[PDB]
Amino acid sequence: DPREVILCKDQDGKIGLRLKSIDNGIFVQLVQANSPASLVGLRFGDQVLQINGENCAGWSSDKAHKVLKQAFGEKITMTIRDRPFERTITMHKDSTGHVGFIFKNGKITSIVKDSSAARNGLLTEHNICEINGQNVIGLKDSQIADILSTSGTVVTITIMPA
Amino acid sequence: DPREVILCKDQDGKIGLRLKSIDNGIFVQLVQANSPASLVGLRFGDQVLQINGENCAGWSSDKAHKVLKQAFGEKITMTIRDRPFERTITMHKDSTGHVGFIFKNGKITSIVKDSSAARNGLLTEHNICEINGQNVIGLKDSQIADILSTSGTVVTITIMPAF
Ligand SMILES: CC(C)[C@H](NC(=O)CCSc1ccc(Cl)cc1)C(=O)O
Ligand SMILES: CC(C)[C@H](NC(=O)CCSc1ccc(Cl)cc1)C(=O)O
């Protein structure tokens, strides 16, 4: 169910967005903290259907970025589909405080045998988006580990295919 | 979220299932019409978490198939997540009766400019699973076209990233 959003460019003329072309669509790759993008609810994995009423279908990442950069005025309109690839998985820490996965560059790379991750069908080649509702996009691997280590027993992660 | 299913092998010793290892999970790639698999509601894109209470995590396609083939007894339990990557998109036919995409082998390959498919952000490298609630997995491309051609103006398609 798409929604329309209005962004007002900041002091530098930016909205705080990086976009990526995938499967002839345009998706939010990065939302800068406290940016116009952040303040209208944009998140990693949001799909951009329209920029200023023009279809993004088949646009390169460069084209989407050029269109945003060239946009005359204070106001940019986007049609957004909320994180359509988003999946949430709930795991429980074992006696050693582990849920049972390895990751690199925010991307899950292996599932530990007979772990909570194994029982719950956690998948590799998926980016970690949130841990217990907290956004981890753009964090270093050691900061993601810090958040997992400081979690209670219940660990809910939001993932998306890389 | 997960559900348990019990299969019995048919007269030929088959359950009517092909499994595929993707991202260190196990997914249903094929369900044969009127198979034991079909009758317990297994579908293309279902995730298999457990076979006979053992985790499928990190299993090769071969291992999953060996485990099923060697399963002692008539009775096989599987823990299933229902088509977890399944997404629905609604489009409207234009004056020519088109929503605006090309597909081959049930996989969307291009989006037509200025179409309902374009406006609604339909994606390529996605398999068509259902049209207007009707399952099209296993149909020939001409049969998928037949269903789209006989649809009313509103076309709701269920898609999934391709294997
Ligand atoms: C942290 C969570 C996922 C923990 N897993 C592990 O410790 C294995 C390695 S992940 C990792 C990768 C890079 C850094 Cl810099 C730190 C850690 C668990 O299984 O519950
Ligand atoms: C059929 C529907 C999806 C129609 N799109 C097209 O006709 C382009 C060609 S797809 C196609 C591929 C194989 C067969 Cl055997 C038949 C058709 C629309 O855009 O509404």
Author numbering:
A (entry chain B): 111 to 272
B (entry chain A): 111 to 273
According to the publication:
Syntenin is a small intracellular scaffold protein that contains two PSD‐95, Discs‐large, ZO‐1 (PDZ) domains that bind SDC, an N‐terminal domain that binds ALIX (via three LYPxL motifs), and a short C‐terminal domain regulating the conformation of the protein and accessibility of its domains (Baietti et al., 2012; Grootjans et al., 1997; Saito, Nishioka, Iwatsuki, Kumagai, & Sasaki, 1975).
A new compound with one carbon spacer, further called SyntOFF, was synthesized in three steps from the commercial four‐chlorothiophenol. The small structural modification, consisting in the introduction of a single methylene group as a spacer, resulted in a > 10‐fold improvement of the affinity as compared to C58 (IC50 = 37 µM).
